[PDB]
Structure formats: structure tokens, C-alpha cells
């Protein structure tokens, strides 16, 4: 790990540009194949990221753990970083063995980063194995604004993590607004998951979430 890595991690633009000017290797990576660009993006430091990109940093570089600069930018929640990476040719949706930027953005409630990725043609219903769709992640982590936006953009309401629907995920949490939003957008309140459980079955007894499900569930057909 180099001085450039550290300047990038800290968001120390003047030090970073000074080091670049001296001729240090912009693309030097650690044993985990982490570049200075990876560290700038993880810190959400857009000016440092752009300076590195201007000097030939690899916009689609992959760490040993499958992280790209774009994934790291989605960890930080810096929309500015996401934009500059995409400007320099970052791939928005990645192959299966690489960490998914949009799913991390949604998990952390970074709605603007999510919208930018969707605007750059990431599949709104992209189901990462065992993680689920963006809507499923949003429901798992009680990201109300992300849930609302995804539904409005046409996310498949029942598409989650194989048989676990977004409503099943929401039922395990404590957010009532998410329950009504899913229901309003046509969620199937009756269907059962891989454990044979309905959303109502999953809700905590006497909880507000359970109450919401009870109030929205139609009568026996």
C-alpha cells in the first residue's frame, strides 16, 4: 500500500495530485488488488477519483473480493463518484461473480445512486442469487423511499429472493409503510415461500406490521 492509496482514502486532493505529478504509479495495487481509485471511491472522494481517472486509472478494476470502483462508490453513497465513474466507462451491471453496485446502494439507502444506475440501464429486477432483487433488498432493510421509487419505476412487486417475495422480507421487519406500499402495488398477500410461510405467518404477533397485513388481507376466496 502506497502514499497515493492513503491520499486517496483520506480525500486529500492536493497531496494526491502532488504525488501523481511526481510520477508515482497510479495503477499500483495491493496484494488484495486494491487500487488508489478503489480507495477514493470507497471514501466518496470524487475529485480524487477523477484525478486518478484522468491519469489512466482502471475504471473497471476488480479486487480479490470482487469489488469494483463503482461498487465502492455505492458503499460511500457518493452520487458524484458514481457519475464520474460512469462517464469514464464504468460497467453499471456486472457478471455474477462480481459484487453488485445497485444492491449495495439500496441496502445502504442510497436512493440517488440507485436511480443513476437504473438510468444507466441496470435491470430493475436484477436478482442476485441469495441476495434477491433491488426491491427485495430495499424491503429487507426498511428503505421506504427506495421501495416507493422502485415500485413507481415498475419493479416487479412479487420478485424477490426465489420464493421469498419482497412482502415476505417486509413482514420480518418493522416498517408498516413498506407493507402498504407493496400491497398498493399489487403484492400477493396469500402466497407462501420456501418454508411454506405467508407474509402474515412471518409477522411478529401483535405487531404493527402484523396489524397492517391483517387489515389488507382479503377475505377467503
UniProtKB/Swiss-Prot annotation:
An example molecular function term from Gene Ontology annotations: ubiquitin-like ligase-substrate adaptor activity
GO biological process: endoplasmic reticulum unfolded protein response; positive regulation of protein catabolic process; proteasome-mediated ubiquitin-dependent protein catabolic process; protein K11-linked ubiquitination; protein ubiquitination
ANK repeat start and end residues: 1-28, 32-61, 65-94, 97-126, 130-159, 162-191
Keyword Methyltransferase: no
Entry's localization field: Endoplasmic reticulum
Description of what induces expression: Expression is induced by XBP1 in response to endoplasmic reticulum stress.
Superkingdom, taxonomy of origin: Eukaryota
Statement: the UniProt record of this protein carries the keyword rRNA-binding: no
The protein's annotated pathway: Protein modification; protein ubiquitination
CC annotations in GO: Cul5-RING ubiquitin ligase complex; cytosol; endoplasmic reticulum
UniProt keyword terms in alphabetical order: ANK repeat, Endoplasmic reticulum, Repeat, Ubl conjugation pathway
Family: Belongs to the ankyrin SOCS box (ASB) family.
Quaternary organization: Substrate-recognition component of the ECS(ASB11) complex, composed of ASB11, CUL5, ELOB, ELOC and RNF7/RBX2.
Purpose of the protein: Substrate-recognition component of a cullin-5-RING E3 ubiquitin-protein ligase complex (ECS complex, also named CRL5 complex), which mediates the ubiquitination and subsequent proteasomal degradation of target proteins, such as BIK, DIRAS2 and RPN1. The ECS(ASB11) complex acts as a regulator of the endoplasmic reticulum unfolded protein response by mediating ubiquitination and degradation of BIK.
Protein name, as recorded: Ankyrin repeat and SOCS box protein 11
Organism: Homo sapiens
Lineage: Eukaryota, Metazoa, Chordata, Craniata, Vertebrata
